[PDB]
Amino acid sequence: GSSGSSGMNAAVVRRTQEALGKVIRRPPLTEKLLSKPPFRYLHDIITEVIRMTGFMKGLYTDAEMKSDNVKDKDAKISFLQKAIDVVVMVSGEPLLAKPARIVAGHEPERTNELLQIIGKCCLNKLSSDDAVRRVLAGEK
């Protein structure tokens, strides 16, 4: 299996378990899965948050919320890039989590940081409408 090399300690992971612990109920918030999540696991969170909390609602089209359409690495990067954009805009927090590193299986402590700020936005019950509209206006 792929190694969680550089950073990614238990105190980062246990903070993500508290941050996502109030948001959704589909994927299990395991130490293993949060130490290096697959794209499908992140897509499960990023679509289920819209269903359960309403954070990032309307940010994806009807085809973008389906992981069999989001099969290509370029589409996976584009899908994560939309979430990263709204999460930074709504929370006011910086993120060093690059969509390319997330899909390649690198920098997983920044993937945890992204999920912790998604947690922050959900705990504050934020509607995200203006930030979602800025990412939609950014479409080609």
Residue 105 makes CB contacts below 8 A (sequence gap 6+) with 2, 36
For this PDB entry, the determination method is NMR
Q: Phi, psi (5° rounding) for residue 120?
A: -55, -45
Instruction: Tell me the C-alpha to C-alpha distance, in Å, between residue 129 and each of 41, 55, 78.
Output: 25, 9, 19
Q: What is the largest CA-CA distance in the chain?
A: 41
For residues 96 and 50, give the distance between their C-alpha atoms in angstroms, rounded to a whole number.
23
* Axis-axis angle for helices 39-52, 108-123 (nearest 10): 0
* 5 within domain boundaries: no
For residues 8 and 115, give the distance between their C-alpha atoms in angstroms, rounded to a whole number.
14
* 3 within domain boundaries: no
* 59 within domain boundaries: yes
Domain with 21, as residue range(s), is 10-140
Which token pair is 15? Answer: 């903070």
Domain count, the chain: 1
Q: Indicate which CATH number applies to the domain containing 61.
A: 1.10.418.50
Kindly report the three-state secondary structure assignment for every residue of the chain. CCCCCCCCCHHHHHHHHHHHCCCCCCCCCCHHHHHCCCHHHHHHHHHHHHHHCCCCCCCCCCCCCCCCCCCCHHHHHHHHHHHHHHHHHHHCCCCCCCHHHHHHCCCHHHHHHHHHHHHHHHHCCCCCHHHHHHHHHCCC
